[PDB]
Write a protein that binds this ligand. Sequence first.
Ligand SMILES: [Fe+2]
Ligand SMILES: [Mn+2]
Ligand SMILES: [Mn+2]
Ligand SMILES: [Mn+2]
Ligand SMILES: [Mn+2]
Lengths: 332, 438, 350, 37, 76, 479, 136
Amino acid sequence: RESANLWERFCNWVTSTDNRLYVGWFGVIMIPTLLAATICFVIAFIAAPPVDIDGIREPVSGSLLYGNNIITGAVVPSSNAIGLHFYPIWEAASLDEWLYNGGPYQLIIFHFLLGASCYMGRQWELSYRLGMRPWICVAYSAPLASAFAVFLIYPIGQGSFSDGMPLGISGTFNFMIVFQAEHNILMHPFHQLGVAGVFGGALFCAMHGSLVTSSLIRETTETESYGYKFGQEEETYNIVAAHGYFGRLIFQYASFNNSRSLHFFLAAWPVVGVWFTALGISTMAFNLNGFNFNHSVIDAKGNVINTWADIINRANLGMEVMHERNAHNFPL
Amino acid sequence: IFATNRDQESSGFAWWAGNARLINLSGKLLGAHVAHAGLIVFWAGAMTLFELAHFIPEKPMYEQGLILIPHIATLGWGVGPGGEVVDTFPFFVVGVVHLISSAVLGFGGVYHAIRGPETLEEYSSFFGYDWKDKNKMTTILGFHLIVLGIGALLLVAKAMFFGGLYDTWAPGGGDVRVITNPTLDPRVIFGYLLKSPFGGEGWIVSVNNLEDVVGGHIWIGLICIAGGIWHILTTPFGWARRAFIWSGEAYLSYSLGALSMMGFIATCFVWFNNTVYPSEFYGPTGPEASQAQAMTFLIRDQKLGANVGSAQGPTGLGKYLMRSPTGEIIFGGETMRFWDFRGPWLEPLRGPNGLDLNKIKNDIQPWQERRAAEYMTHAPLGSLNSVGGVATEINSVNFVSPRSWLATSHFVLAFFFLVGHLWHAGRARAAAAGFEKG
Amino acid sequence: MTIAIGRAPAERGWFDILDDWLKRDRFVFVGWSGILLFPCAYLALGGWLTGTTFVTSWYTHGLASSYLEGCNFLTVAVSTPANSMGHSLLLLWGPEAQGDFTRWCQLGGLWTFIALHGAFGLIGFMLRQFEIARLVGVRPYNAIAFSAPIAVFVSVFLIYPLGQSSWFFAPSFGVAAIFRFLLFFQGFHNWTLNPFHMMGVAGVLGGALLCAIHGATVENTLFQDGEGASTFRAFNPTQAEETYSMVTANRFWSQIFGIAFSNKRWLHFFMLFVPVTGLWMSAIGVVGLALNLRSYDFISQEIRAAEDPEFETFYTKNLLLNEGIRAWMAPQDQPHENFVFPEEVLPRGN
Amino acid sequence: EPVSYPIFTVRWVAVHTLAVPTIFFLGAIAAMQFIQR
Amino acid sequence: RPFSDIITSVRYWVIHSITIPALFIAGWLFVSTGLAYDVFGTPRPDSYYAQEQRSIPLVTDRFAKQQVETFLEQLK
Amino acid sequence: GLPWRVHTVLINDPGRLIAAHLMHTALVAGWAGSMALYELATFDPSDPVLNPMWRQGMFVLPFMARLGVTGSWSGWSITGETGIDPGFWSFEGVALAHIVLSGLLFLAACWHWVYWDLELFRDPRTGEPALDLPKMFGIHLFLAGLLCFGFGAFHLTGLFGPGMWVSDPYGLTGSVQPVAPEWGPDGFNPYNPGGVVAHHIAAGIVGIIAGLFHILVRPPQRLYKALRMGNIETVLSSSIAAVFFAAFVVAGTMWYGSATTPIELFGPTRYQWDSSYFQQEINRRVQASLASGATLEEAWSAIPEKLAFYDYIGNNPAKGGLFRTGPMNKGDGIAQAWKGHAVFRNKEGEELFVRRMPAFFESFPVILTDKNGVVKADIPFRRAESKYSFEQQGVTVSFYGGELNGQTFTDPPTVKSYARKAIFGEIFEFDTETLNSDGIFRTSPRGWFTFAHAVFALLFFFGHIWHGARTLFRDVFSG
Amino acid sequence: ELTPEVLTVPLNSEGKTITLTEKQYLEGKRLFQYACASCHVGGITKTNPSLDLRTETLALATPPRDNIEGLVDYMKNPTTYDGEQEIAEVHPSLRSADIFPKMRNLTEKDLVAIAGHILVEPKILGDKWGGGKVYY
Ligand SMILES: [Fe+2]
Ligand SMILES: [Mn+2]
Ligand SMILES: [Mn+2]
Ligand SMILES: [Mn+2]
Ligand SMILES: [Mn+2]
């Protein structure tokens, strides 16, 4: 048949390209999945009916045509009522109901992931397709995680995509704030390591790129321118000088094998730093919040003496007290 | 040929990869694998006892960060109408058993990394792996599906032909036992197929019928024993054969994700399910908890005299009821969502369209109030320290919920192991081509 | 028409020329730069540890800020002087010296101490990279990257306060007291709406991004050469040839992401450009908030929103939170004034 | 050339000015841990 | 790298084994006594407030600040 | 750085670079006079008492003002115004004056580029030769100096007199006087103009001595080898760090200090308001009249009307930034006279005061406490279960003084709205349209000027840290 | 600090007082967190906010619950705020110790300490104990 014969053998060879173409195979899912969502997103964002994000009836509208600019939100999350149910675009005779119940959201989400997930899958094929070594693949396993958290985990943790980050600048800004008053995150190791991770990565990226160039030386131239120168041879930068300066600045440096180890160190520091933060949330989703150091006392009486962590609360409170009104009763 | 050993240079891998070395040396790994095993056995015992010790009776399990005990309970021990610590003895039992049952391993574990054939051749035993003999690989696995297989059955038996498998229904608690159912139908299969997861319905992670679980396992204990038998018999086939690569690490990867998945399934099954995870033992399951908050206030308020059915919240929805979407009714708020809840107490108040403004209006016995009041105050949530609750708140308690610790760790685990899978399967796929380278 | 010198080579006759040699030796690099870095750095690293475990805030804020008082790493902190004292370098001499060093501590000298000293220490370290970089005969591009962080540091610790009265609204050099600063900002200056920081974020988060691609790319692109099987950490740092290999990298991306530029001599610059840049940008950002020039009002929508009560954007919601934070957070925060917001305090619903 | 039997080494200077103090607190702190009021 | 001789010296052990605890204990005394307290002026649980009026004093103061502080401490 | 671118060329040259420079000059005076004309075809002479540059613022104006220029045809001033016237050659002129000289420069930049161429240178040686620098930085300083000096004696000090903007606290009076111061013173305090004038006279001469010297006594090999001296880069970063420094300070004094940053010609300063300044001056103003005869019423018123305005939040650079424008206008609206503060009283009239708005906040509530912090009445948010409701009133929202003296309102709203407005300075009557006016505060020159200059000053750091690099490091730049 | 007035509270409604010992104070905190904090954390009342443990509120209850004896009585035989109906089936107490297990292990001494905690805390925390000021 058509599907049949060498045709298949041929088809198969092309994707493989181888270277031649551119692619390849995984894409065969990635590609289409990602196109649906990219397309659904664009349209919803440019123009779409306010969504009943909350469990109630006060439609938010983060799209462009209904009174927005880029910073002001995107595609608001499904309804607090659909909660966890699977609300495609079939259920209900009218699509107009879909837009309202904030249905476009679930489309994007489910597809993006499933795609960026394939993207991680394909991300490695061309490895096993050019002699390459895997790993890079796991490097992308760090952001994918962070995305399942913010789109599958957290909701599956709390009973509804309704909560758990919306598309668009502000929507994030919401998500983010709300969530901190709900878990004191800032006081949770897993985020902390995420900051060291990310804050550091940049720090490090600065250096590698920095020292390299300062060498380369060678021268050549013158014045014028340168670158251229370258282629392878010969290399363009040639280590030694680099090391001859770095070492001289901080102290005597050592690792398994310079470049070969001076690059692994780059490849992991941020990756593991971010990793925990993917968990960190997945953690706080199934609900296990950050630290809570609210009361130290003057036990000479019991009157309570404050502490920089008390204020953190005061603020989280007036953040909790409003937020949603829706719520109613008782508480949460 | 000659005498074994060699940690590095020769071996390659370097330390912190002082395990890959055992990938080749059957015996050596045996105990690596044996010891470790016991190591869990150990833990098991170590903990139950470390659990019991710190265990006050009739003072709520979940209220005592008790991860283990509850398990035993479910099975059909330490019961009395709705957890009444009838018999903390069974707990001390499983304790020692493992703690001893471990040295037993420990010895015969440490016994393969230091003599014994190494182993170688051784014889037978031894182984091989796999390279040499893709068949024993098969026959061993299969010779295991029996073990894994038999296990199941033990459950069903305990449950029925033995002293029950406690059910948080009846009706309540208880337990029962049961018977089974399971066986049953299938429908057991229908549960998957359808369923888804988502929403509711859703798944499983729903399954309520203690019967269904019991009679269902039957199928599995059978299901897989069949496989362990059939597997031995032959070498795979020709697609299975061509489709998969074959190596310790490869197999590793293969079975490394085998867990991450189930792993997840785990976290969920707990945090959501409820039957397999009572609550008289564990926590009150977030969904349920956000729901007893209604019972208490519709109850508290209707106890002041506001007609529930017509009451209208700020939104203009249903402040009490409502319703759812479808319607139903239921509840609401915000408990709008977990209207998939379902479970004891809240059940009676039900009917066809759910929650009878009639029952609710007057047919809700005074124990549901307390129970529903308890839960929300506990639930879960927391913070750490723990405390618991818221954040803011403060102081006281402590203390945090058991129902969440369980579900907090596993994701972390399930997840990582997925890193594992890939990481450990893109390498296996690079050796299988000569890469590293060149 | 003299395009040349005054009198022959050297410097201050006997010494310098000599002194240079001494100060520039070869065991754990000292240097002139260090002659003014070390005192500071240490002097300033210490200061923080001291308060951390030994000094209180009470009189300046009213929070316990040391281990001794009962805090813990996170909760511990070296609080800011009281607003009562505004902008004084609060030298151990102005508001009386000899009497109480103790009181210097009380009022809050340990701050400026850490601020001003670290300030110079940061000046110091930049030089300790210029001294060295020049000696070894290598490019100062490491110092440009460092100008970035300093900027980030001069805006938030020196400028800002000079704007909004008195250091005090300057972070307190506290693990947890920084978070208050964070939130404080969110709710008060509405940082998010700030295109400027918004940028910064892009940089830092993106600098971390690049750091994990490259790194992963490298290790994954590597060669067999220098083989010995597993644990491939054998590249002769002696010199010669690429360890990884561009072409392969390039072909990969090209067939994957659709942009795989060559010229490591650009990949390592792009890696510098990002973070350095981003911090300068976001740095301007705060220099702005230093004069309360901020966001917190698109203006085009708070107007369109006072007519349409059925108007709702993730923008207005965040604007609500911002206000809840101010109302509740306040009076614990800054005793600078009397604040007693009766229970009609901006809650609503729960 | 440090390590090999001098003692007038600046390296020694720093190396300790961080050391002594720390130990001094590292204990100081373990001492506070015992406080009730 | 370098540093592994002295730490493995044995005589080193001698000199420090006598010096370190010596320090560890001095501080532990500087803390228990009160100097820690009286020098860094931080309040011992006993001294917060005065059981007859709160005003987390500033402071416021100052000065005149100090003079003000003094009175504050005194009255306490 | 590496790569780247360158331128250177210029350086040194020299020639051509000078073209590059001759041109960039022209662009500023082009702009320089040019701005003025914008400002000029929009400037509101109507009422200096309430619709000042401023408010318104101026910008540009302020300066023209302070240094001695205050008026044009229509024939108005300040211143015165018445018328014044014276112137004769003011505003109008200063502006044009720049358009001409900005053109000569251009043209000059022209034939100085076609001839290098022758121467330067030587022888020884032869051778161348880049030039010779040490002679330059010796001869230039000579002029600069002579110039600094001049300005001091012959201008500020008087005799060719158009001095500078002086004014006694709280504004009100004030003007250009010899212125013166011167110187021485001994007063170095930044406010006492005195300094302004002595500084320049001294610096000036100090300038001449230093310059002539620097141009008559060459640079040591060591100091000459030291700063790569002789290769422009170094000259640049050297001066950039100096603008970098000049800048920073300027930003500072425009935000706090004065006499080169005067109340009238440029915003009140947040600091005057933070300190509840003025109002204590108002209190003494009335209190004396109030009691001492016356018554019551017245015182117040016484116281112014001018002070009453220097309160009010719309004018505090805060706011814012961006916002823006205007301011200082689209926000507030146009300053239409004063309504006199009012004294909100209880059902008995316990004077009751209104808790001012911090200039840090935006969404601030009305508290209204007894003359000692006791909360005598504070407008609710959750009316249910809410006490201290305004029922007792504050109904004594009764005003005293200008355009509303003797005239109370018991109506709960007017009483209440009035508080909401009282919540931040003396309450004024505003013109909303005619500029549309959004209703939201907007900073001022004092606020902007001090926003740019600090940012600019901070970006030039990366300027120093970088160019100076090329200086000390040229050989490797290729590397 | 744990001064006399702080530990001395009304024993009964007749005006008799009792000065709790420091060990009764500590035992009270322990016991209160054990059997009451799940719902009365910080002096509030969860399942029903208006009925807090603030001393004034207790004083206007029927019968007076602003004394040791009265609270003791409450833990044994709880009533609605007007004292017109006993409510042990909803409120933990010695009478309802079969459904409220944590009450099974409380001794008369225990009940006295718990009662002492309720009356003392507000003298230490001030409003924070009532409707949670620092907490709300
Ligand atoms: Fe690199
Ligand atoms: Mn929500
Ligand atoms: Mn919520
Ligand atoms: Mn919720
Ligand atoms: Mn929520």
